[PDB]
């Protein structure tokens, strides 16, 4: 999609990013991005979880 | 001409400078949608985030 200027700010997204503002929103973001990849092994099966996380180990 | 040496009252009273500065500080929507537009923008520059002392 192309996204509008001026857009109200709505959504638990938005309400966060009229708080926060959008860049924190990004760095707060990219560090649950590290969250779920560090502390969760998840797929969109079990066999792709499983797979993900493998360790002779 | 030279001024002379500086002698203003030292501690007049806050509510006649009030009375003088609220009305003069008044700005036109479209004056107060700038400076909306710009602060916000430099403050969540600001809150992008090592820092400084107040961080600490």
């Known amino acids: ?57 | 001409n030279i001024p002379p040496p500086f002698t203003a009252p030292y501690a007049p009273d806050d509510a006649e400078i009030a009375a003088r500065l609220l009305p003069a500080s008044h700005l036109s929507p479209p004056q107060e949608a700038r400076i909306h537009r710009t602060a916000t923008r430099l403050i969540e520059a600001i809150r992008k985030r090592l820092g400084g002392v107040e961080d600490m």
């Open chain 1, 1 to 57: 999609r192309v996204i509008q200027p001026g857009e109200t700010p709505d959504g638990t997204i938005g309400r966060l990013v009229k708080r926060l503002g959008a860049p924190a929103v990004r760095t707060a973001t990219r560090q649950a991005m590290r969250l779920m990849g560090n502390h969760f092994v998840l797929g969109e099966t079990i066999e792709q979880a499983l797979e993900r996380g493998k360790p002779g180990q």
